[PDB]
Amino acid sequence: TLAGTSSDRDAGIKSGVQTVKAARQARLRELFEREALMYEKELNARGLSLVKPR
Amino acid sequence: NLRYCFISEWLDPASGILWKYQLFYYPESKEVEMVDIKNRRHFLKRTKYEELKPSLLFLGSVVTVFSRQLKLTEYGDEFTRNRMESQSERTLAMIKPDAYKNMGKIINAICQSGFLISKLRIGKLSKEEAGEFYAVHAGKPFVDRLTDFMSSGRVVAMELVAPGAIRKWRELIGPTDSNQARAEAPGSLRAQFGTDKTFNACHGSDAPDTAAEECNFWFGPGRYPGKCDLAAGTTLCLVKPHLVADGAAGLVIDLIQESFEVTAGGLYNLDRNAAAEFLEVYKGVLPAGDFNSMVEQLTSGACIALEVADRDGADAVEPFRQLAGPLDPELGRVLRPASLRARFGLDAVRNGVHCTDLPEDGVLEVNYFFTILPTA
Amino acid sequence: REVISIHIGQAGIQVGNACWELYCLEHGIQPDGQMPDAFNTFFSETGAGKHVPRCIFLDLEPTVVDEVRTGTYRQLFHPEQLISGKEDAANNFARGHYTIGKEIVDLALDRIRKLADNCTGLQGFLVFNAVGGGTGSGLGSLLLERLSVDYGKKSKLGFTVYPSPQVSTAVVEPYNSVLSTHSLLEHTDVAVMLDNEAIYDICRRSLDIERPTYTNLNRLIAQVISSLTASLRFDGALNVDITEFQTNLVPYPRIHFMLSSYAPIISAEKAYHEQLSVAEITNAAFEPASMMVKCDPRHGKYMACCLMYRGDVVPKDVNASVATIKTKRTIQFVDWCPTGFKCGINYQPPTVVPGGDLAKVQRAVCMISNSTAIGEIFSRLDHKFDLMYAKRAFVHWYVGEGMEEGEFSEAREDLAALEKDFEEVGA
Amino acid sequence: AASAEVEKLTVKSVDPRKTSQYADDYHKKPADTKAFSKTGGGYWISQR
Amino acid sequence: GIDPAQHRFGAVGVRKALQPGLDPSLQAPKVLPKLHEDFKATAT
Amino acid sequence: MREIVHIQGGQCGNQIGAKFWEVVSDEHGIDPTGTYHGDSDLQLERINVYFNEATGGRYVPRAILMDLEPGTMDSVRSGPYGQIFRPDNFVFGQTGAGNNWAKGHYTEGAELIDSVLDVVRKEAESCDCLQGFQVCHSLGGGTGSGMGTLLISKIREEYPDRMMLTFSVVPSPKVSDTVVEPYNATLSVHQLVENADECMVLDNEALYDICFRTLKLTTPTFGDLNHLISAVMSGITCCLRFPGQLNADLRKLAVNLIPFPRLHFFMVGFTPLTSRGSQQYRALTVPELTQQMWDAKNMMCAADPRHGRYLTASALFRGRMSTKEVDEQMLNVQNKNSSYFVEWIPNNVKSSVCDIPPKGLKMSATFIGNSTAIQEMFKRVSEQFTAMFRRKAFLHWYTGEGMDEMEFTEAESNMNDLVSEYQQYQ
Amino acid sequence: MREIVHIQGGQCGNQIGAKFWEVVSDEHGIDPTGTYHGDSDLQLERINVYFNEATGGRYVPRAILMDLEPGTMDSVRSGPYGQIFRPDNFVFGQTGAGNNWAKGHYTEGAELIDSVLDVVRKEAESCDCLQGFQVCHSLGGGTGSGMGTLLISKIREEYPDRMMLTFSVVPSPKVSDTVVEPYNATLSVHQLVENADECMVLDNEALYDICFRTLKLTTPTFGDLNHLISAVMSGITCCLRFPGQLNADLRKLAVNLIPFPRLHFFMVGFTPLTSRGSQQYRALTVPELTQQMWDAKNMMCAADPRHGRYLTASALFRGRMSTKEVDEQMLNVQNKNSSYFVEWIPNNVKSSVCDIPPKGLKMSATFIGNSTAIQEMFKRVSEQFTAMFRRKAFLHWYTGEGMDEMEFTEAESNMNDLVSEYQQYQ
Ligand SMILES: Nc1nc2c(ncn2[C@@H]2O[C@H](COP(=O)(O)OP(=O)(O)OP(=O)(O)O)[C@@H](O)[C@H]2O)c(=O)[nH]1
Ligand SMILES: Nc1nc2c(ncn2[C@@H]2O[C@H](COP(=O)(O)OP(=O)(O)O)[C@@H](O)[C@H]2O)c(=O)[nH]1
Ligand SMILES: Nc1nc2c(ncn2[C@@H]2O[C@H](COP(=O)(O)OP(=O)(O)O)[C@@H](O)[C@H]2O)c(=O)[nH]1
Ligand SMILES: [Mg+2]
């Protein structure tokens, strides 16, 4: 289904569109984590580095 | 003071009634004002927008003020008339399939020589579709064989707006015989990318009324002719308003046409509610930047979007992502200079091109952008 | 053997939010509620493949509570135990004890009744609150009162968070503290003090976190509580249940105030640094540099001490170490209690929390003592109460709620009585 | 510095810290919880 | 180059200073010497 | 859950309110078209404090405009986030008081206040649990001070159990618009000390000093000063709209800050304020924020705090920060400058931390100090008042409308016994 | 850790400091844009003494520029390594003193010194443990001497427990810029002998003679003179910034070189200094450096040390050396020229070795000698002071501003008793 019924909003169950959106966000985050782990090695091959948060 | 006025209309986002907003724009102070035509009351006072190019505003154009995009339907004043009689000259400058293989250089030449592209669309025409076109040339057997040639490849159709636009285009094309054009003027586009008199790379409307009719045929109110979207093994790329404004669209599309086959493309000036949906998945990541700011830049202007496909036809996501390089233009410029984001992406949020990022995601974004937004 | 745990206030439910994280991590329960008999003292097994804790979070402001209702542990407590009011008590004892209490305590005790009825072998209660705030002090005291008239005979373990002397984040917490003790004296059975500045110095010195948040504090407090209940949850060589603290640690009907401490509080590289054994952790449990309340036990004399050992501890060396402690003369006991110790040994070591700051040590010690430095602490609070009360500052908020000066005067003289009791017992 | 810690830092480089302290700290991966078993803490005593 | 009548004589935001995270010019360079970051990871 | 209704009065209040609702809408991520387009789910959860969804995610502000000239109504439909408001809530006269306190409190009030009380009654009963009311007005104007003041009086007569925040700008002699500023301010103060719970004193002099020195701006127009006060107000009510490691509601802040029922006039500041040329050269730490907070040049009143003592103070921080660092900084500040705080109250500094910073900033602060230096500002006003009252200047337009001289003497009495008791606790 | 803040006064002070921060940044390997680009790790651990990390490798110096005329500040931002200072540290007047000590100490000071004190305070508590302050200024100019002198007095009153270095140039009749040189120098020295902990005396005459003889330059501009002074200042502070086989901090050198509280005027040298034509024809050994170090024509004062005795002396070496060679060289110098040393103090030479040489060199040294030949300089100045003051020339531009005559007599008496006690200990 695309959306939720009237009982879903009370039961707290998220709608189909909401759940698919969240899952998509998180899969994307995984991909960019892999990409960052690759870029760090590619930079240290040259002697430069990414900046890391504090 | 000087005032350019237009009635624009704006349908809103959740109570369907359309209506006119009449608009006053002051060139000297870069100032825009709005008063509703109905109710005789002010809407937006003497505030400094200065985000709209005065050249960009013209009859039938869509401009976004304060998160509302309202196309200017038509001016009210006769003063504004003469002043924009000047600019609002429109022509239909479509291309032929023989030059379609090298259309990036052509669009580059166009917008770098000086023009405006208003609306752009790539399609593939059926026989009845090409016969619906060229309606005035139905009796000529030359055209009756032309239509079969035209129905073969993938055609491009762009609307050109410029002062004296019809005349400049009839100039830059060159005579229909490309051999004599090669002999006469090498700078002519037909002489540059023309094979035979029978085949001309670029076709230009010879009359204002004819252009007004063929423009309507190509992208009329409810018309989306010759849609050619191949969902399998295709990726979505977004040429952003930065490139649309500066004219690097020709610089990017020839570059990507060199490496991949380009299939379907259009000029979509999204609404905010469409941009939020399209983007909404990159708010988790921090490399992309503020989700609100990123969405805002995308709605701030027109943008082109093409379906990219690879030569082998296996999958285009990964190869195109290596071509696009890193998400940040600095990272690209340092360790992937050949990337186009590194080449002409300004900074974090003003990056040049946006791209699909997942193989499960490419076809989804593509079919959305080429069926869902276009139908609505 | 089953014990239920209620959490009152902004501080209490965050501490509990670390405790239950620790419990599920110790018993192998995934936060969504299922495992991939020792747990039975905390989690009731409803139906199949589900375990719900025996606790009630309750508070008047909904912001922290629905932060839980949206956090990671949504599936652990479903939304009917997490009681939430509409508006806060706002650091106002009278507002929490009379205005909103009268509307929330009935629902609270009505819920705790059918929690106890689901239970069968109820050991006791243990509450979590900070006495500086408004909700944790006022309606906490009102709740403890109605629970004491409900059952009475059952032990009530009050783990309170007192205001530190110099580092403090409120203004009227002396008023709320004094008004809290006036009921915490004659209601709870065993009241454990846990200040904040001592924990700050602990994570600054031993754990060497220089920018500690509240998560790290609540994490190691949860480690102390878990080390307290490990004797009930897991089998060891010498088990000690909740009823023992009632007898072994409280020599008088009113002297129930316990300083806690813990060792070895060690990071991930100092563990490889140090050779860990029983003699030094028994030492480290007694120096003021590892106590949870900023006070100097050198100034006081111990009444009775309890030692919870976890992990790879045999009983001969704990006996040898406490023999060395009793023969040392840097610390002093009272002449009343020659048997000043109570050991307890459990087999399971303390676990680690991924992303935590503590390493997996083989053994650990939780010390819980009783001394007269606490009598010094209460005098420190009484002095800073009397100064502000001398000018009648902030009084009009309490009287505007509906209280008077009479309870202020009688709580003042009550702590004066407590001060006299500690100083006469010290002799 | 430890290689695994450096890797964790470059992992956290991508997270925006746009969530609250509570979630950001108390978040758990499903592999973070180990099944219950008799560890070598103090269990070699009773297994004689 | 002034028309004596039409010319106007006489001599002719804070969000940018408030929220600089949006500002594209003021940013981290995002690429640093490896030795520097390896010192910083253990220092900070 | 907890509810704040917003009331705007006078020209200065209306424009401040416009920028305030601009900033709030930006922090919650709703566009001026009234739809939601934010990012984090932490934004959706506490928008009932300021908004009501009407039909499908359309959020209207819970605000009531109140004025007497249509020029103000044009100026509030002026900017973006101006069409977001509620057309019915534009309760509005037509004549115009025009810098006359008697016209704002006796003549035009008699025909406008019944209407505004009805619409604010509808806004109060539209929600479930009120937390308090929040009005923004001035103390020099006529349609702002007198009208809003009676509004405060009638509301406190109606709902005596809710909180009340009043953002009031006060006249200063260096930046002085009208000539009857003391004639209106003293009467406004006279009624505010007996009606309102607490008042956040502001002024334009300190704002221009800030925009010149620390912002290093060229042309600080009014949109900027209103932007600064807006950021202040958003910083105050951030703890309700966002979760924090140490929560502090409005009433909690009031009971921590107000030791006596008449000692409730606060000086406010904000941090960080950096020039765009020196922003890159600055670090972002808690001590960096604190050293700018306790700077006397960063306060938003014309009252040098080192000319008196602090009674209490509060610091609301925004952003993921170290709590130990927060408290040690407050303690160090309290210990170094030990004479500038009051003696008979220990730990004069209450603090709170929120996890959500403002948009674009990494870590921000908001200072609220209840000092005794406000008696200088009331003295510099009362002296202007008595100098004019010794010669009865400008008096006839006031007495000829219904007011009498005894009201002016009562204002003198209350202002004077007020400043004597601040001097008493100094 | 151990902290040194920098204070630059006057035109000469600003240009000297510009070269100083150029060479320090060069030593720590940071580019003129403010980021790190070095190669060795040794530079990273001790940049906290002279910098503060701002954001992403942005290290701003802990410096405070201070003067009264914008020409000097513009010349600072014009050259390279001018884009790294914090613009808030450009505390700065508008009128200009102009060779008037009374202007620099009584009138313009009253409105500039509170502001510089604000920023130097904020920059002092920005760090944890102060080692001391480091001031570069002149004794001939007005805005340098007078303003810097009062700043020294205010600072020594607030932080009396911290060390203090003053690099002060003195005027000489042979290189004479202005006319009121003695009226400035006498008063400044009179204040420095009770306020400053120690002073490193410089002068342009000896520097010009050095670039003529040893350097054999053609056009000795101010750039090279400031270049030499910078190399001296980096040489004296290298011990804190780098490890070594024997570390000697600032207070360590002070207690080693100052036998009496008023005997704290040092003369300085520097080695190696060689002409470019002979740059490759020379050798690099510790005896080679010691010969050039103990030469009388290598001192940076116009005081022939062979006309007096060294009370004490110190030499700070940089580079991989054998301390045995270092100490025996000091012993040889002390044994051969035994008449030029004091008798009642044995082993008058303190030494130190650091293992990091300056950029481009293999081995360098820095000599600091507290001799008694400096009384020749002060007699040379005081006699000019008496020659002018005995007939009251130029006196009224000082008396007309707040100063009186007994101040000049006080400076005379203090100068006279100082040189007499130097002559006594000779
Ligand atoms: N150890 C610890 N103490 C906390 C924590 N949060 C708040 N506190 C303490 O709680 C005391 C004030 O009471 P709070 O828990 O904050 O608030 P409250 O008890 O719910 O009372 P109200 O604020 O009126 O709702 C402060 O002195 C804090 O030191 C925490 O997470 N851990
Ligand atoms: N900060 C700020 N102050 C304003 C603005 N407009 C007016 N004021 C102040 O309002 C004072 C006069 O009060 P006024 O606005 O006329 O009140 P009213 O006449 O009752 O509406 C003047 O001293 C101004 O400083 C504004 O846009 N921003
Ligand atoms: N070494 C050096 N000395 C200088 C420089 N500029 C000025 N001086 C000396 O300083 C003296 C004048 O000091 P001045 O700069 O006018 O001091 P101020 O007016 O107080 O700032 C002159 O005798 C010069 O010899 C410089 O760039 N380098
Ligand atoms: Mg609370």
XYZ file of N, CA, C and O and ligand atoms in Angstrom, chain F residues 10-12 15 99 141-144 177 181 204 222 226, ligand 2:
84
model
N 1.844 47.780 18.184
C 2.574 48.943 17.735
C 3.383 48.671 16.484
O 3.543 47.538 16.030
N 3.908 49.753 15.913
C 4.712 49.628 14.705
C 5.993 48.857 14.979
O 6.360 47.954 14.219
N 6.692 49.201 16.061
C 7.943 48.520 16.372
C 7.704 47.058 16.715
O 8.473 46.183 16.306
N 6.854 44.949 13.378
C 7.977 44.636 12.508
C 8.919 43.643 13.168
O 9.465 42.759 12.498
N 1.255 58.151 19.346
C 2.145 58.563 20.427
C 1.390 59.222 21.569
O 1.906 60.126 22.226
N 6.006 54.458 22.185
C 4.890 54.740 21.315
C 3.578 54.809 22.062
O 3.488 54.566 23.264
N 2.535 55.168 21.324
C 1.214 55.243 21.907
C 0.366 54.026 21.611
O -0.207 53.432 22.526
N 0.291 53.628 20.342
C -0.532 52.479 19.995
C 0.106 51.168 20.408
O -0.576 50.141 20.423
N 1.393 51.178 20.729
C 2.039 49.986 21.225
C 1.948 49.876 22.729
O 1.468 48.871 23.259
N 13.311 58.907 19.794
C 12.442 59.230 18.663
C 11.498 60.379 19.000
O 11.593 61.460 18.418
N 8.490 60.410 25.351
C 8.970 59.080 25.716
C 8.864 58.811 27.209
O 8.320 57.758 27.582
N 17.548 50.283 21.262
C 18.217 50.423 19.980
C 19.627 50.961 20.111
O 20.443 50.746 19.209
N 16.790 48.575 9.808
C 15.915 48.042 10.846
C 15.701 46.544 10.728
O 15.461 45.888 11.745
N 15.882 44.028 14.056
C 14.795 43.098 14.306
C 15.259 41.660 14.152
O 14.757 40.770 14.845
N 14.143 47.769 16.604
C 13.197 48.501 15.978
N 12.678 49.562 16.629
C 11.734 50.324 16.051
C 11.274 49.993 14.706
N 10.346 50.903 14.379
C 10.223 51.747 15.431
N 11.054 51.396 16.419
C 11.202 52.073 17.716
O 9.928 52.451 18.211
C 10.067 53.670 18.929
C 8.800 54.470 18.737
O 7.731 53.616 19.105
P 6.641 53.283 17.988
O 7.163 52.200 17.083
O 6.312 54.525 17.205
O 5.401 52.748 18.844
P 3.904 52.976 18.326
O 3.729 54.356 17.749
O 2.968 52.818 19.497
O 3.600 51.935 17.279
C 11.265 54.391 18.349
O 12.106 54.844 19.411
C 11.991 53.352 17.530
O 13.311 53.181 18.044
C 11.887 48.821 14.061
O 11.547 48.473 12.914
N 12.815 48.145 14.742
